Amino acid sequence: GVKMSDKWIEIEEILSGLIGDLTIAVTVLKDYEGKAFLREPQHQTKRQCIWRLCVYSIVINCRKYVELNQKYGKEIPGHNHIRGVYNNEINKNTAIKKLRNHCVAHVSDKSKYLKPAEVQEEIIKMFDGNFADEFLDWICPDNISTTDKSESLVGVIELLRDAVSA
């Protein structure tokens, strides 16, 4: 029959998942980047596989954050602005959607397919160069505790979760 949507339950859930998945993808990636030997030529394949593992998860979740936004203008408005800012950054960075789409597409759906060299290019575009620090810190900085939560995606997503918990 009919019922209440419990929108807010679903939203708290999704927000919480976003915080954890984005945080862990960054942490894992940084952990492995801390192993210098992985930058050697005989480990390139393995290293690339780690990057895809973490990057695919980041892009899937960045898009989810946008999709949540476009579904729920039912949002607390004291943060209405910072939220749109992060929403906008993600759309601006088109490598994100491109990577998500490829990673998630059905094998038969080749309209979204990126060849391996293309995936590599898209990853460089996403990070805006050869250095991951900026983008990673923008997703989730180390010791996010002592951090202006306006200054990272995960902090902003936490700003919303905590508000919704009320």
Add this chain to the structure above:
Amino acid sequence: GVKMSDKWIEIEEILSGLIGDLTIAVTVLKDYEGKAFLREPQHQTKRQCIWRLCVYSIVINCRKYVELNQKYGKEIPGHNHIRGVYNNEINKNTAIKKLRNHCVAHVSDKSKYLKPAEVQEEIIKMFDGNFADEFLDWICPDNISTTDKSESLVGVIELLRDAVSA
């Protein structure tokens, strides 16, 4: 205009990606499981996030293996059987598709949505219990080199890749 499909190029690519992504997801998961402190209560969230990271990737790739199979009966037939066996195991294990679908679905598409407790249940179903060893070893065993390649998903996928390289 019209051209050759270069099916075989695409297939070599996808197979190669499958080998690397399945292998790394298992390796990462095992690496973190080797850190005993992560099983403590204050780390449950983080530990769960690691499991989702790796499990989502495994399920996405297991399904891709099936989808590749259903798209290309153009396949070497000396391995025609082992391939269908692994294809069948994956379909049999319905938690795999369920998890894939949830992880990949659009936020607005709630026909596939699993609540957090449901995701946890599905993960236990996938592993057929509280111990990951069997399923993980079935995906990709340690030192896969000294291993009957018929005895793991990744070995079988390597059996095909290597053949296709010809």
